[PDB]
Amino acid sequence: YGSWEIDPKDLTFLKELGTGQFGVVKYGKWRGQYDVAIKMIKEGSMSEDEFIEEAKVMMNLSHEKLVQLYGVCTKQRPIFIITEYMANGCLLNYLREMRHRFQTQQLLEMCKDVCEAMEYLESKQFLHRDLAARNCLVNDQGVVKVSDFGLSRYVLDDEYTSSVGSKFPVRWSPPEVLMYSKFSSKSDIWAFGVLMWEIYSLGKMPYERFTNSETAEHIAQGLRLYRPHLASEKVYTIMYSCWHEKADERPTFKILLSNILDVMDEE
Ligand SMILES: Cn1cc(-c2nc3nccc(-c4ccc(CNC(=O)c5nc(C(C)(C)C)no5)c(F)c4)c3[nH]2)cn1
Incomplete structure (x- = not known):
């Protein structure tokens, strides 16, 4: 109708x-x-x-x-x-399939695809709120696209909505989210940096040897995820810049896009 x-x-x-x-x-x-x-x-x-x-x-x-x-x-x-519809499914499952034998130029193109979607959302003042590789999809052309943006607001499950909940995206959250429920474009920036880490780690779990509680403590003490082996120093510099303790010191998606394009030109 x-x-x-x-x-x-x-x-x-x-x-x-x-x-x-x-x-x-x-x-x-x-x-x-x-x-x-x-x-x-x-x-x-x-x-x-x-x-x-x-x-x-x-x-x-x-x-x-x-x-x-x-x-x-x-x-x-x-x-x-x-x-x-996205023929190649979940980006997380796609990254974990070792048969693809991804070149670093392909991993950067995935970061770029996500960054372009995120800069568009940022320009419409729309938050994803659950940016992660599990919430990205891959089409038949290997193009990565951001899925289920803003849908987190309609989830009724307390295990998902509570920051102490079992299903809450703790490992993709900045300190101000875990400490004070302070959500902004800068909490999506933080999650994007983690997503870049997931891509360059070929889908490893962020903070793989920690629990959600230990990750929250780690992050609150100023400690961070370290460099994936497939990430160059310039790529690691970009993802790291997303994890500034001060939210206002984190870049915008427009700035990240310019940084990704510059690295694409460099490598
Ligand atoms: C093996 N395989 C699969 C495909 C696949 N293609 C797809 N194309 C489009 C869409 C899907 C697709 C999209 C989502 C889900 C499950 N999540 C949700 O529904 C949901 N989560 C949330 C938040 C984050 C807010 C909690 N919101 O919604 C899904 F199971 C499939 C696709 N799958 C190709 N191969």
Whole structure:
């Protein structure tokens, strides 16, 4: 009915893609020809009425490096979220497949793709709030795109929303987030630096030998993730700059984009 509204009868379900915070995600066709991913929102997992109002704004967030929101199926339950389909799945799983034998130029291009999406979001004053390789997707061309931006606000699960919760993204959070719940564009910057570390580590867990509690203490004492073996000193300088103790001293995504482009030219 509405601009944001998709008729579920227009969907053909073809395969299960995975399960996330809101349940199963399937691959399908819209009106027989258009590839889509269909989030089948499990009951009690989402602030549905609030998400519905926000979907209108989220649908207007259009950028080549952002996994596009096509619409919603709300005249029912489970409600569906219809997005752009990405053939190569989750960036985290993609990084961990050692068969790709990624060259450093490919790893930087992944950082660049994410940075371009993040600079676009930053320009619209829209926070991702859960930037990580697990929330990035890869298309059939190996292009990396930012997925599920701003959806964290509609998660009803306290294990995910509490900074002391089991599902909270502790390892991707700056000190001010863990200490005072101070979220800003600079908490996305911090998460982007960690994502750069995940890319250059080929999907290793940040602070792999620590628990969430020990990571929070480590980070609050001014200590940081160290240089991945595949990261040059210039690349490590960029990710490190995201982790300044003072949020205001962290770069913007526009500054990071210029830094990534300069390194691309250097290597
Ligand atoms: C083996 N394989 C898979 C593909 C795959 N392609 C895809 N294309 C588009 C989309 C998906 C896709 C996207 C997400 C999820 C699970 N997460 C959520 O739904 C969700 N988390 C959250 C926050 C962060 C806020 C908590 N918000 O939403 C998913 F399981 C699949 C895709 N999968 C290709 N191969």
